[PDB]
């Protein structure tokens with residue numbers, strides 16, 4: 001079973017499995033039942049921005065989601081990633097739909113990871129920035145229904161040619177190269193991710209959400225993880 | 238008076254004004270009496286590295302000081318900088334000696350500040366990195382006994398030609414350009430500073446320490462700030 | 475008697491002083507009479523992007539100006555900056571209008587300067603990025619009619635309250651901190667500048683242009699350098 | 712066959728296949744017979760630094776190799792990479808030994824690639840920096856005799872326990888993720904690579920050299936490319 005650490009932008013509330021009674025953002029550590037959440041005033045049809053940050057000194061994972069001229073939603077949680085994730089991982093974006101749908105369009109995504117070992121200026125780093133996605137994005141591993149190229153955007157879940165979202169869809173996009181997230185000999189290790197999305201829904205209550213996640217290198221979409229499971233978890237435990 | 242926020246690498250314990258009975262690192266908010274401190278195993282004659290970080294989401298200021306092949310001292314403190322510092326500040330390094338002395342050599346210094354406002358990828362940033370200092374460092378405002386050029390280093394406090402430290406010396410070096418540390422319309426604001434130093438001392442107990450600070454633009458060394466005041470405070474209150 | 479090195483986005487052809495008989499971009503070394511130019515299909519009312527680059531290895535200064543879904547204008551020129559500019563300079567943007575006007579709006583501006591001396595990874599660098607300008611931009615030195623704040627933009631030349639550009643106007647904005655552009659002991663020295671502008675003109679032929687420039691630290695707008703002189707030169711020599 | 716663009720630090724002169732009669736640095740475009748070379752005063756036993764740069768505006772590939780306190784060798788060549796390399800490539804380091812040997816130790820390696828298309832601040836970038844290599848470097852694809860971990864360095868060619876180099880050895884190390892080197896809709900595309908090496912040789916004339924290269928994603932060591940072929944070319948055409 002995959003080891004997952006994710007920050008979810010949960011648009012549909014599934015109270016039966018622990019979700020709060022409204023759209024929210026949460027920090028999930030190995031389970032879809034968020035260890036911490038915050039109310040999120042999702043704005044249907046508007047481009048928003050998510051920013052995730054973490055550093056080994058504070059051992060605190062935080063996320064801020066906001067829309068232009070609007071209050072931002074903030075969530076933070078104390079977690080020592082050394083004891084949760086393996087040394088090498090893959091980072092990515094996941095999204096899903098179930099009975100209800102929504103577009104899970106990613107317009108830009110950037111990631112920076114830095115490791116500082118016990119030495120002078122000896123800092124190892126990885127940084128990638130996508131402000132436009134091409135049809136053949138060789139450095140991205142697309143899983144499920146995720147596709148790129150449509151107007152230079154990344155569509156995590158299935159969308160029809162006329163532009164409408166489909167139900168029962170799952171898709172992920174992971175950066176090709178493995179990332180060295182931590183090391184026992186690192187004085188300081190830190191990462192930062194940012195991505196802009198566009199969640200549009202024609203129906204009543206949009207579903208299900210988008211999630212930025214970190215996982216074991218060989219992770220793949222668990223079978224039957226559409227809907228509430230966000231393409232990350234095998235069950236709702 | 239000046240508004241000061243600093244991270245001190247205090248080498249001499251002044252128990253009468255609140256210092257712990259050993260060398261330590263501390264976080265000072267408008268007072269030399271550190272709001273929080275941590276034991277620091279200072280290594281006389283060795284080059285060490287200090288790393289300070291802060292972000293508006295966690296509103297937590299942290300510092301890590303370490304020497305190659307040795308544990309690192311860490312100190313953190315929750316503080317909302319919007320309520321302590323003016324919108325525009327100047328960042329710098331300060332050091333002093335009193336009855337006892339030590340060299341306060343800075344071998345490198347780097348700083349990165351980022352402000353993200355309510356817009357797409359509209360991030361304002363400033364970054365400077367000095368790995369060598371010249372005799373005529375036009376982008377540094379030197380105050381007190383601070384000088385540059387000797388072997389490409391920055392000597393905060395007075396050192397004679399033969400290479401030995403002088404007592405009752407104070408010196409600071411501030412980056413020329415003002416830094417926009419925070420803004421009411423910022424989704425995320427964060428900064429990071431790093432510097433390597435070399436504290437060498439002929440005497441028994443070295444004194445007094447080095448400090449990375451942030452202050453009002455027009456700040457200058459308070460009178461009598463040699464010794465325990467680290468060139469930052471006018472009194473010990 | 476300022477030393478000026480500039481890349482001009484010349485909107486009005488002043489053939490009496492050497493201009494080609496059409497809008498163009500040019501590389502000026504100490505004189506308004508460009509050492510090299512290239513035809514530029516200026517698009518009234520549209521946001522464009524200028525990108526300037528230079529490195530001490532090739533000792534070649536190049537610039538590219540372009541608008542979306544349009545051909546870009548390119549101009550390059552071989553010049554050893556060590557022999558033209560002082561070691562320390564200030565970088566900035568300049569603009570002017572004469573009998574004819576146009577708005578000289580700057581929507582963003584970034585600059586990166588790197589110096590690599592004779593040592594291991596010993597690189598000195600400076601980088602600043604403005605994606606939004608505030609009313610009180612303390613890190614910018616505004617000269618002439620230049621102002622900031624209007625919608626988060628930088629208006630190099632005077633614009634009335636309704637939005638119409640004014641004739642006979644000059645404005646410049648220089649980054650506060652001096653920049654160490656070159657050093658005799660540098661293995662590699664290089665810089666890069668990028669800025670987006672919006673030139674709008676209600677009249678027949680727009681005038682006069684915008685220019686990215688590098689100068690001696692104490693430079694200021696020369697007397698009567700409105701119009702064709704772009705706020706950079708004292709005369710048309 | 713593979714498409715190769717490389718910058719070689721050739722330590723052994725093979726006059727028969729076109730090499731100058733002294734150690735040199737050269738730019739190879741699809742052939743081991745450099746399109747341009749420059750004399751290189753290789754210093755056996757000392758750590759050196761290579762720096763490669765290129766940009767689509769000047770369409771010029773340049774390299775600078777140097778040792779602390781010594782003049783540097785420089786070589787440049789005009790080449791439009793859009794017409795030589797496929798859109799997606801992999802970048803790496805190669806080295807080989809033949810009848811004669813030398814150690815081809817890489818102590819650090821960094822690369823930055825940027826693509827700016829017809830859009831506002833829409834820049835795609837990739838950057839990685841290794842200042843230490845681990846035993847299990849998951850983001851590197853090691854080919855041939857290349858190994859990592861020995862004192863935190865990357866040994867491109869076979870070396871023994873006591874530290875001496877072996878003859879008839881070839882090794883390469885490519886960054887895991889493919890790199891989007893150019894795009895028809897890019898206003899500016901550029902890259903920069905830097906690496907520090909240590910060439911030590913106990914015998915008469917060291918051989919054969921180190922090379923930084925760019926190739927088609929699926930490139931692999933051609934059969935019998937030890938010696939003068941540098942693990943890059945199938946023959947000496």
Ligand SMILES: CC(=O)N[C@H]1[C@H](O[C@@H]2[C@@H](OC[C@H]3O[C@H](O)[C@@H](O)[C@@H](O[C@H]4O[C@H](CO)[C@@H](O)[C@H](O)[C@@H]4O[C@@H]4O[C@H](CO)[C@@H](O)[C@H](O)[C@H]4NC(C)=O)[C@@H]3O)O[C@H](CO)[C@@H](O)[C@@H]2O)O[C@H](CO)[C@@H](O)[C@@H]1O
Nearest residue numbers: 013014015016097098099100168207224225226227228229
């Ligand atoms: C076709 C498909 O892709 N199927 C996926 C599947 O998707 C799930 C599907 O769920 C539809 C409904 O399923 C159940 O009936 C309920 O869970 C229902 O949720 C509402 O009711 C439950 C129980 O009463 C509540 O706990 C839950 O919070 C929710 O409440 C409703 O919330 C709205 C908004 O707040 C409110 O306005 C309503 O009043 C409130 N209803 C009530 C009665 O109070 C589901 O709607 O589609 C969902 C949305 O797309 C997914 O989230 C579901 O997962 O999932 C499985 C497993 O993950 C997958 O394998 C399958 O392919």
Ligand SMILES: CC(=O)N[C@H]1[C@H](O[C@@H]2[C@@H](OC[C@H]3O[C@H](O)[C@@H](O)[C@@H](O[C@H]4O[C@H](CO)[C@@H](O)[C@H](O)[C@@H]4O[C@@H]4O[C@H](CO)[C@@H](O)[C@H](O)[C@H]4NC(C)=O)[C@@H]3O)O[C@H](CO)[C@@H](O)[C@@H]2O)O[C@H](CO)[C@@H](O)[C@@H]1O
Nearest residue numbers: 250251252253334335336337405442444461463464465466
């Ligand atoms: C010349 C100059 O620049 N003067 C500065 C001046 O510098 C100060 C000066 O202080 C010297 C001594 O001053 C007092 O005598 C004491 O504060 C003494 O400190 C020891 O004693 C006090 C009081 O008993 C203790 O509270 C304090 O912790 C310290 O204790 C001693 O600590 C050592 C190490 O742990 C231990 O080995 C001893 O056993 C212990 N002593 C006892 C009795 O227990 C000072 O030494 O020089 C200092 C060092 O350079 C500075 O830190 C002082 O600031 O400062 C003023 C005001 O800031 C400035 O204006 C002036 O120019």
Ligand SMILES: CC(=O)N[C@H]1[C@H](O[C@@H]2[C@@H](OC[C@H]3O[C@H](O)[C@@H](O)[C@@H](O[C@H]4O[C@H](CO)[C@@H](O)[C@H](O)[C@@H]4O[C@@H]4O[C@H](CO)[C@@H](O)[C@H](O)[C@H]4NC(C)=O)[C@@H]3O)O[C@H](CO)[C@@H](O)[C@@H]2O)O[C@H](CO)[C@@H](O)[C@@H]1O
Nearest residue numbers: 487488489490571572573574642679681698700701702703
């Ligand atoms: C009020 C103010 O700010 N004054 C500035 C002043 O600004 C200058 C002013 O110039 C206006 C005209 O001045 C002269 O009459 C001419 O130079 C004229 O330029 C045209 O004519 C000359 C000479 O014949 C040509 O060499 C030149 O290319 C231009 O040609 C005309 O171009 C258009 C477009 O291509 C074409 O359609 C016309 O047919 C063609 N005319 C002819 C006869 O062929 C000036 O227009 O305003 C200018 C524009 O705003 C500025 O560029 C001028 O500098 O400048 C001084 C000194 O710099 C400053 O101190 C003063 O305050």
Ligand SMILES: CC(=O)N[C@H]1[C@H](O[C@@H]2[C@@H](OC[C@H]3O[C@H](O)[C@@H](O)[C@@H](O[C@H]4O[C@H](CO)[C@@H](O)[C@H](O)[C@@H]4O[C@@H]4O[C@H](CO)[C@@H](O)[C@H](O)[C@H]4NC(C)=O)[C@@H]3O)O[C@H](CO)[C@@H](O)[C@@H]2O)O[C@H](CO)[C@@H](O)[C@@H]1O
Nearest residue numbers: 723724725726727808809810811879918935937938939940
């Ligand atoms: C074991 C192995 O890995 N083999 C590789 C193989 O490696 C090659 C091998 O070459 C050894 C010698 O091979 C021939 O004898 C010559 O090419 C010789 O080179 C010298 O002589 C030629 C011809 O006369 C000159 O053109 C050439 O420049 C060189 O000149 C000598 O240079 C020195 C220094 O300037 C000077 O002092 C000498 O006087 C001068 N000699 C003369 C006669 O003038 C080779 O030495 O090992 C080499 C070094 O390790 C490799 O570079 C060779 O490639 O290569 C093949 C093909 O790539 C590979 O498949 C095989 O596995």
Ligand SMILES: [Ca+2]
Nearest residue numbers: 010012013014
């Ligand atoms: Ca949910």
Ligand SMILES: [Ca+2]
Nearest residue numbers: 247249250251
């Ligand atoms: Ca003290």
Ligand SMILES: [Ca+2]
Nearest residue numbers: 484486487488
């Ligand atoms: Ca003109």
Ligand SMILES: [Ca+2]
Nearest residue numbers: 721723724725
């Ligand atoms: Ca050779």
Ligand SMILES: [Mn+2]
Nearest residue numbers: 010019026034
């Ligand atoms: Mn949830």
Ligand SMILES: [Mn+2]
Nearest residue numbers: 247256263271
């Ligand atoms: Mn203290």
Ligand SMILES: [Mn+2]
Nearest residue numbers: 484493500508
């Ligand atoms: Mn002109």
Ligand SMILES: [Mn+2]
Nearest residue numbers: 721730737745
């Ligand atoms: Mn050669």
